[PDB]
Every structure is written in structure tokens, then in C-alpha cells.
Amino acid sequence: ESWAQSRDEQNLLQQKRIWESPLLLAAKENNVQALYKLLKFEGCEVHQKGAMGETALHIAALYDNNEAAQVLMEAAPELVFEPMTSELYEGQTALHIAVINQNVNLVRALLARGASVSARATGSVFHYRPHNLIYYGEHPLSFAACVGSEEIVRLLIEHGADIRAQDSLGNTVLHILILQPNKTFACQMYNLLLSYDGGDHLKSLELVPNNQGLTPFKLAGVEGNIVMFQHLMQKRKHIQWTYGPLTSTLYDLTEIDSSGDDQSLLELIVTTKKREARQILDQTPVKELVSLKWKRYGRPYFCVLGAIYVLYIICFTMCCVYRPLKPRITNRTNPRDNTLLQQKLLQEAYVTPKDDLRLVGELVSIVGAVIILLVEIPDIFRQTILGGPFHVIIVTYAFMVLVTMVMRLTNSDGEVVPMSFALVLGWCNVMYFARGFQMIQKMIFGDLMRFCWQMAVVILGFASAFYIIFQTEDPDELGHFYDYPMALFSTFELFLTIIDGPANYDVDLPFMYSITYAAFAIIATLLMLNLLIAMMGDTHWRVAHERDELWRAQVVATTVMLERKLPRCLWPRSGICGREYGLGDRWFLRVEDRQD
Amino acid sequence: ESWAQSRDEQNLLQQKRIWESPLLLAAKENNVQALYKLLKFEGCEVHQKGAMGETALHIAALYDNNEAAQVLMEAAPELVFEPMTSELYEGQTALHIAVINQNVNLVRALLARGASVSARATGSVFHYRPHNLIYYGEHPLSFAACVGSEEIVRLLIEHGADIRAQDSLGNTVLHILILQPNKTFACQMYNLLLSYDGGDHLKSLELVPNNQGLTPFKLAGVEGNIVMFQHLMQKRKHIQWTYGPLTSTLYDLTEIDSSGDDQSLLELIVTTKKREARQILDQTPVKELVSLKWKRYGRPYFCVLGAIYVLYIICFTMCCVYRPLKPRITNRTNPRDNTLLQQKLLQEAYVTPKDDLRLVGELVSIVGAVIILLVEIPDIFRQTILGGPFHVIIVTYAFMVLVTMVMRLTNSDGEVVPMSFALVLGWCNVMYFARGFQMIQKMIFGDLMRFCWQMAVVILGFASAFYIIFQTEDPDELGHFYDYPMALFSTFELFLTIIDGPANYDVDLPFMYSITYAAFAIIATLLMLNLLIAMMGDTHWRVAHERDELWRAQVVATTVMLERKLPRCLWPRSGICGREYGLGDRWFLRVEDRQD
Ligand SMILES: C[C@@H]1NC(=O)N[C@@H]1CCCCCC(=O)O
Ligand SMILES: C[C@@H]1NC(=O)N[C@@H]1CCCCCC(=O)O
Ligand SMILES: [Ba+2]
Ligand SMILES: [Ba+2]
């Protein structure tokens, strides 16, 4: 079907041609007597391309068959240069197979015959695909670095192996070592390849970026390689002094910061779907960074912008609790008796008695919605959620306010449908602002205050909704929300299922109650389910760290969020510059640590 | 009472005859001087059958009494051939006891006297019953293989021990070794018995099947023997090549596949009540098999057949939401006022105004029900549940549709009783189709979507039911379900106990509400209980694997389910054939693995 089933067939088709071709069969079985009987007399095709376009030397290189390979090179030395003419292995030579098998004597003999150390194995098997179990690159030097054979690495360098070489994906030999499972052993091989660098400050091998704009140091962070990241950190930190147990080390903090403006480590961790990369922001050069960004500047501006959004939403409800005003006027209350509508769509906006208080309030709800769009719509052009789906809700909230404006100036009967949606999307987006937090126990009390915030926020978005839903309808029948102080008290009682369903079907309710109350039943249970997991997940195991860690990543994702749109006069740059004094120009972070 | 209490008495009755018989007493106590005083002068019964029909040599063989046994064989060599004449040990000879005790010098002396190596111990103690603590077989070669004494095994083979021998249950010496507790040590003894095989490709000892049609390789899977299964897998896998860390091994995949058509490993694991056998489908030759069967062919046809069943059930409700139509007609609403029935049984089927849309819809519900019976009724003749009780519900669903047809064409008043049952059995059988799934966390979100699917499926089966239950009755009193958009909204509110019981007892409700709402109260709580265990069982321990594993077996049981009835043109055979190319005819699976 796909090809996974194809190659399965080609590998079987390979063994079929090996079984058939006696030259390829003797190269596999290492039949030395059968190779001289075959090459010297009885005249054969020594350039015999097998199933996978392989030579007899390729088969003798796949199964360590040194005695059989040396026969194929002394009788026909042209077989060394021949690559795999197939599509699965296009570009692979006999040297690539000898390097991965760590055959030192075969590599020593292949280089003695003059093997190309720059042959790119562009075959489909060597691609960086999930259906390929290993990704080693294309050049034979990169294969030697990935197998951990330091002898073959230097033996290739001695024959002119360019460490500056990049594969099809723009990865140097340093990038490929970071994508290897054996993290603790790849650090040893990483230092061997750096020793053969040009020794010049310009055109450094560690600075050659990926095709996706990623230096090797920057790649270890996006990939969550803890061992390589700590190892690469040794090369970019300077110990200032040692005062006994203290070690006031100075970290580089260059490629771990903004402007690239896409090009930072922090942005790449909070926006990637790789869970494993989360752990990088906990390392000793990075954990001190985001902690200072959140203590000052971060936490205050979060609450300053939080209180601004709290007032911006309570003003929207202030214009809705005293919504616009009509008696039914129409005699349609006699036909279709089920209906209870006392619709208000009294357009006649300009009664000036007190309204002008509402009017300037309605003007605030408009100028704030476009401002929300003026900071989020130009941002979608340049999307992940660990922040919380705040961005998704804050744009749909300003969408409902503008529709209510278009709902207005046309005198539409369905005023209530778009206006009620902006009430929940405005409040329940506030509970996002609960992240304003700096032990098995005070963790129970800490997550409980999360619920009291999220609960009080939800009921203030549905009680104002349920009020509008039944402020127009008749309060004699189904009057759970006849005024505001009892609409909040009935919805609060609703939140704990102590009161029965505000339904009453002798009389037909509006199309919005059968929709708004349905969502109030799911959120009121998920918040009551998210509270039990807080209460129990705190104590049953050290999961609480697992519960803990992400909120911390949620705050880190929010901390990067608050630094993108805020101007330069507020929120100064982290670290200290190095231009006068002395080390400029990169901004460094002074960190001291104690040891026990 | 039973016999367990019997033999308890015979073992005590044995020691009673041993205590009494001085010949049997001296054979037990190894009294050499008392045996010559007893056999040479003072003339005794040397063929003295004890309580369990044992000879004096049998007692001297039960307690390692070599000095006492050699006396009983030099003075009466006929005691060797004598078996136990009792019923508990019928067939056991003095060699069987010497082999299990691993008495090498007694076995060497019993074979020197000419002991039968083919004597079958058919006694009731040697049976494969749960009340027997060991099952070693019948032949003395099988006893030597089970005790792990490789010296006695070969010593018996040297005297003509037939390894091809089978006991009463058709088990060779290989089958019995797999049913042993010491799995890691039985692998050593398994290779010893295979070495003495005929060496011919035909009539192989590993191919001799059980009496229940089970080769030794096939038996290790049904019994969950992980150690033996991996060991027996070495003999049916071929390594194609080694490309460094990769090892592209080719597995046999013969006796692990269909047609036998009862005779496969997969069918035997998903249908057995043995929990332990579940672990076999996780081994490295098998885990790659069912994974490819589910990615392609498996998952799409599951959802293709799933969407077909979703439309087949929503069409059934489409014919019920607009059910057939009568005003009460009858003046019986004045007597028995409690009743609210506005019964509709207006037979007069052929009003053609729109009905013909319903009529062809009712025709679909019939032709689909018999098709369900045409694929499940011929299957019950040839029953386990890890799939899920889908099969049990899908036949009872088509049973209710046919009863509604018989309910029709007779004008029965109880139309509603069989028709309402098909609504829940049709939807709640859909939630089975939730198995369409490809970490502590995304596991919480993964099991939560299980609930949202199962919840939305249940309410769509009871809201349509509660509608029919009260579509006939008066909606002024107890009108929770007067139309469809409010029958769904009231049942959804019912699902979370926010609304009060749609009961109203001033007025008598139909016999079906007091039954349908009772089942809606149990399922709505079990699904809310199955959600809490998902939420907490994910995180408190690695149980989530335990939670995880079975769903995986549920999918494997479903994957075998979808391959039985589907034709041959769809769903091609797994693996690659071996006829041209080369290895034919068995279908092999190409598997490569990386090592770190
Ligand atoms: C074994 C095959 N026979 C051969 O001559 N080259 C192949 C080497 C296999 C390497 C597969 C590495 C990968 O998965 O991409
Ligand atoms: C001890 C008994 N005395 C004897 O002469 N044979 C018996 C041997 C007991 C073996 C019981 C094995 C079983 O449980 O089946
Ligand atoms: Ba009335
Ligand atoms: Ba309750």
C-alpha cells in the first residue's frame, strides 16, 4: 500500500537477488574460494548491481566480510566509488556501510583505495522521517560521529573530512549529535569534532545555524536534551570569583533571549508541541532568567492589565444590566400563548435622562474591543496554547461586541443572541488572569483559591447572562432572574445544583436559555472536577510537581506574552550589558550558587 | 464428601498399612537388617500390595531408600515391573518415583534391571486437575524433563525413551514443559529434548499438535508464557542484515495468523478467559502485527462501519420522532382520570402526503436489522467479551425492530414498549464505536473524550425514548418532553440531576417511564463513576497502563472482529508472501529494531 510495505518487499527482493547472484551470495557468505573461482576464471559481471543497486562490495560491506571485500577491491578497485544506484539508498557508498559497522580495518583499506569522504547518501532510508529508526546524516564523517567511534572520526578528518559539511536539511555534524538517544556519550564526541575547527572566532562551527535557523546550542533546547544543554552551557559561562561555597558565575545569555523576535530560546519552548522541551527552562542558566522577569515587571503588569480587563468587563455588563427599553407594545401576547416575550428594541436611543452614562459606557466597550483587535489581529499573521485559550476567547469576545453594534443600527429582534455571548466570553476569560501566583499542603489551599476565583468568575458571567435572558421575559413564570441581586443568587445556587432547572415548560422560554444553561452545566462540573483532581493530585504522589510544573510553564508562556506588545520604555531588558563595562556587547546574567 | 477428603483418608490409610506391614515398614525406614530377616528366613509375601496397591519397592522408592530398594530387587527382581494397582496411581511404576526424586543411582539400577520407559501413569493423582499440585504427564521421560534433571532425561533417551510419546491429553514432552512454573529454567530442558528429534523436516516434534489442536509454539501464547514464547520465537525468525544499531529481522508469522480460521494465535488470546495470555500480543513479533492491522484497514473500516451505523440509528429515530398518529378518539379520558393517554395507533398507514419519506425510512430499518442478523446469527453457531458487549446488544436491537414489525400489522396497543427499547440499544451500542483511538496527561484528556462521546450517545438514546414515552401523554402535566428540542434539553439536564424527577403523581404516567428512567439513572451514574476512575486512575500510579492495556486488547479484539466477516478483496493479508520471491510459501513480517 504505502511504501513501508514496499521496502519490506525490496529487502526480501534483495535477499532474493543475493540468493540468486552467486557473486553477491559469496560476498554475503564470505566465500573466498568461491570469489576467486568466479572472478579469475569463469568470467563474471563484477559491476553486478543487485536488487538495491548495490555492488558485490556493498554486500561484502553490509555483512562484515573483510576477507571477501579485500578480494573484490584487488580484482576490481573501481567498485569503491560506485554508490547505490537504487532510490532507497541513492548516494550511499561502500564507505558509509564500513563506517557505521565501525570496521576500522575496512575503513583503513577503503581510505587507502581513495574513498570519497564527502559522498552524500541522499537515499530515502537515510531521511529524517519517523519511519526511519536512525537519522545519521549523509556524510561518512557524520556516521562515524553518531556511532560513537572516535577512531573513525579522526581517521576521516585525517583524510579531509569537512566538519563544516551540511546535509540536505542544513544540519552540521554538531546538530546531528544532539538528535541522538545516547545523550551522555554524545557529549564526548561533540568535543572531538570541535577540536578540528578552524580555531578562528569568525565562521565558527557552533555558530553555523540550521536550515530552520537553529544553532546547535539553540537546537538542544527545543529538543529537550538536558545533557547536551548543560554541556553546551559550560562554553558560555564565566566564573567571576569563588568565595568559599559561593560561585558567582556569569552566564552568556545571548542566544537565550529576544530579538531575533522569533529567534529566541524562550519563544521556541513555549510554542512547540514538544513536551520534553519544557524541561529546558528549568536549567540553572534559564530558571534564574524567567524568575526575575516574573517577580518584577511580570507579575505587576499582569495584575495592572488584569484589573484593567476586570473593569473593562464589568462596564460591559453595567450597560447590559440596564439594557434598552420597550414594553411589548404588540398584541402578539394573546396568540401563541406559550410565548412570554416582552421584547425591548426601543431604538430611540437618545433619551438623555441618565443614558448618557450608559452611552459613554457603550462607547468604552467599542473602543476597547477594537484595541483588543488592534493587538491580536496583527499578531495572528505572525498559535499554541499553554498560556491558556485566552487569545482564542479574547478575539471572539471583541467579535460579539462588534456584532452587537451591527445588531444595533438595524433594530434586529435577536439583540440578545450576540450580546449574551460576550458576557461569558468576557468573564470566563478573566479566570485566565488567575495566574498571579508566586509543599503538599499550602498547595491544596493554593489550588482551592484557583477554584474560588474561577467559580466566582463563571457565575458573574452566567448570572448576568441569565438575567438578560429573562429580563425581557415574564418573571411571574420562571422568575429565577427578575432582578440582578436575585439573578446572581439564583445562578450561584444553580452552580451547586441545589436549585432545580429554571425550565417551566407550560410556557415557552427563549432560544438562548436552552443554550446558555447547557454550557453552564458543563463548566460548573468541569470546575468541580478540576477541583477534585487538585485536592487529590496534590497528596497522592509527587505528581503535584506534574500539576505544578505546567502552571509554571503557563506563567512562563504568559511572561513571554507580556513582553511582545509592551513598549521599550517599560519592562527593561534582563541582565546587564557589556559595553562599558568591558565585556560588551552581549547581556550577561550574574548568578551565584551555594554547594553543600 | 468429595474425594479430596477421600485421598486424605487413603494417605492416612497408607501410613496405617506401612505401620502394620513390617515389610513395607522396613522399606520405608530403610531397615536393611530387618529386610534380610524378613526375606530370607521367616517366609514372607514379597508381592505385598499395600494400601495404595504399592509394592515394598514402591515404598522403598518413595522415600529415597537405595540400600532398601537394592535388597528388594536382588531377592525379587519381579517387583520392578509391578505398577500401582490402586486407582489413584494406576500405571505408576517404581521408575516413575525414582525419576521424580532424581535418584540417579536408583534410575541407573532400575534401567539396569530393565524398567519400562513407556509405562503410562494414568492414576487420578497424575491428572491435569486443579486439585493436583503438579502435572508432569505419564511417561517417565516426561517426569525427568519436568524436574529439570537433564542427566535422567538423556539417561532415559539412551534406553529408548520415545520423545514422540503423548499422554492421555495428547501432550508431548514439549507441551508439558510449557505448563511448568519455572519458565526460565524449562527453556534449557526444552532444547535438550529437541536435540534427540529425528532430524527430518517432516514429522517434527515441534509440529505434533495437542489433542485440542495446539502446537507447543501455539500453546505458549494461550498460556501467557512470556519466557517460552520469546525462546520459541528464536527458532522462527531470520535476521536479514545488521546495519550498525539496526537489526532488520524477518519473523515467520505462520502459526500467528488466520485460516485455521479457528486456528490462530490472535483468536485464541482475545477469546480466552486467561488474563495472562493478554501479554503475548505485546511481544516483539506480535506487537508489530496488530499495530499495522489497526493503522491501515483497521481504523478506517471501523469508522466507515461506524458512520454507517450512526446513520442507521438516527434514521430509526427519524421514523420515531414523527411516529404514527391518533387522537385518543375514545371517551375513556373521563373514567380513570389519572390516565393521560392520547393513544395513537392509527393503522391507516397509507396517507401519502409525506409519509412515503418515513415509509422508505421504515423499510431501511427493516433491511438493516436482518442484515445485522445475517452477520451475527450465523456467527453464534461457531462467545467472549473484551470487544465490549456490542454483539450482545446488536442482536437484541435487531430483535426489538422485528418485534415492532410484529407489533405492527396487528394494531397492538403496546406499540411503545418494544419500540422504545430499540432506541437505547441502538445508540448506547454506538458508544462501543468510541474505540477509534490511535503519558499521564493527554491520557486525562483522552479518557475525558471517552465520556463526552458516551454521554452524548446516551442522552440521544433516552431523550428520544422519553419523547416517545410522553409524546402520546398530555404535555400540560409532566411536559418535560413535549417536542424534540426540549426533550433533548430536559434529558440532558436530567443527566446531571439538575432537574427534578419527571414524575408528577397526581397523574398516572405510562408503564415505560417507570422503567426507562430507572435505567437512565444507573447509566448516568456509572458513566460519571467511570469518569472519576479515568481522571484519578491516570495519575495516582502507572495503573494507567493497566487502564491502558485492555483498551488496547479491546482494539485488538475488535481488529480480529473486523477481519472475520469482511471479504478478501478488501483488507489485504498482513506480511509479504514467500513464493517468488524465494522463501515461499509462508508470509513473513519484516521488522527492524534499534538498540542503545
Ligand atoms: C540492510 C540494507 N542492505 C544494504 O545493502 N543497505 C541496507 C542498510 C540498512 C540501513 C537502514 C537504515 C535506515 O533505517 O534508514
Ligand atoms: C506420596 C504417595 N505415596 C506413594 O507411594 N505415591 C504417592 C506419591 C504422591 C505424589 C502426588 C502427586 C500429585 O499430587 O498428583
Ligand atoms: Ba396555562
Ligand atoms: Ba442534586
Ligand SMILES: [Ba+2]
Ligand atoms: Ba431538585
Ligand SMILES: [Ba+2]
Ligand atoms: Ba386533580
